Design a protein around this ligand. Sequence first.
Ligand SMILES: [Ca+2]
Ligand SMILES: [Ca+2]
Ligand SMILES: [Ca+2]
Ligand SMILES: [Ca+2]
Ligand SMILES: [Ca+2]
Ligand SMILES: [Ca+2]
Ligand SMILES: [Ca+2]
Ligand SMILES: [Zn+2]
Length: 462
Amino acid sequence: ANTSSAYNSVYDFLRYHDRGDGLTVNGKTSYSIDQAAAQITRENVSWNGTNVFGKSANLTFKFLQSVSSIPSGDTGFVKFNAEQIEQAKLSLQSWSDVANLTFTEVTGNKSANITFGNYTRDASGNLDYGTQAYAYYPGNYQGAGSSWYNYNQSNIRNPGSEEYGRQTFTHEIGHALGLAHPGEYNAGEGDPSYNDAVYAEDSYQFSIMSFWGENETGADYNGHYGGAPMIDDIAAIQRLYGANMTTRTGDSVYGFNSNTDRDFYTATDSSKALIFSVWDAGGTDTFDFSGYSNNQRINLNEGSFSDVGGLKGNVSIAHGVTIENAIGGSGNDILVGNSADNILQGGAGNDVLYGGAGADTLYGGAGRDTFVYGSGQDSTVAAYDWIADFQKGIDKIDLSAFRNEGQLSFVQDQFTGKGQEVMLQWDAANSITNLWLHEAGHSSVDFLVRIVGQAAQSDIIV
Ligand SMILES: [Ca+2]
Ligand SMILES: [Ca+2]
Ligand SMILES: [Ca+2]
Ligand SMILES: [Ca+2]
Ligand SMILES: [Ca+2]
Ligand SMILES: [Ca+2]
Ligand SMILES: [Ca+2]
Ligand SMILES: [Zn+2]
């Protein structure tokens, strides 16, 4: 019952931002990903009609060059500029990446499902420099799917350099696809706030359809805005149109050295912030967060949140996604794998690595690292872990988790058969050290961790 601090850091991080069940966060009811998704899609409307789910759609979009009138009554129409067009296309792409949607641009007099246009004045003809943007849900009525933005806002005119502009495009397109705010609130109507949120997870950390900052739920993006669908947004849009299983089906790398060709999944250098919820449909994938010096916490479990590059709760993995590998930076990181076979690289700094179930390959990197094992199922003989760069007298292998079944006894070269004993065996021929653990209740030796290098008894934490 007396686990080490290394074990505890993993145990707690695994429960970072727990949600659903009968939990109460910030004095509010906590929603699971699916409950949040249902709430966001409560209008039960999409381009396929009402109460239609898991149905794909082929949609058209258009950059209006002129208008007969804006459905809201606003005036002073202004067409989209070149930068707005490029950014809007990227926002559209971030939605079609995760849901079974196709977007085709149309021009001229052709009608379109989703339209884009700017406004600058109100119905009275007075300049409006206060509002931001709005959009209309799918439907057969005049203006359905149309989105409008205030050209008097610099973030709207320069969405490529002012992050909130791109986020706004993604947000409004969300409405044009059938998504609603996580709560019954609208701009201008009263002075709504996070206090009015129906559930705890109503923030930018979980949905860009929210109006509330990520700080409301404990996350911190240091003034940045993600610009792409977050975890609950992905579940929501997929509920309506189905998941896109053709996206990034090869071996994908997110973060540094990314091969995604998506700005929000790419970090060009250490001064670049990352804010994203990853959707990936196949292949062996890697979270490369090697360019950071900040202490990071990386979790590869689906639905989980990570603390990357000095930010908090800025990276998450969507439900239905399996990410396999992770690379930390020069800081003192915590790398947590999932049930798949993971390759974890701590990088420089003193790191804590936890492979979890499956046959993992672990690299501590330079520094004083700790490889944690919380269960006999973590490294069975049939699917054993490899610690490929273990440093005798420097690194540590943490087995404190087994204390719950009785303190482990270290034996030199033979098992007594009693149980709860650990042994290290050196093979001079291949320079491999086999770490064997005979667990209580096991009639045979079923736990093994193979080490490429030497290891001392004092390197094993029992
Ligand atoms: Ca992939
Ligand atoms: Ca994968
Ligand atoms: Ca590190
Ligand atoms: Ca694993
Ligand atoms: Ca290290
Ligand atoms: Ca090391
Ligand atoms: Ca493992
Ligand atoms: Zn909105």
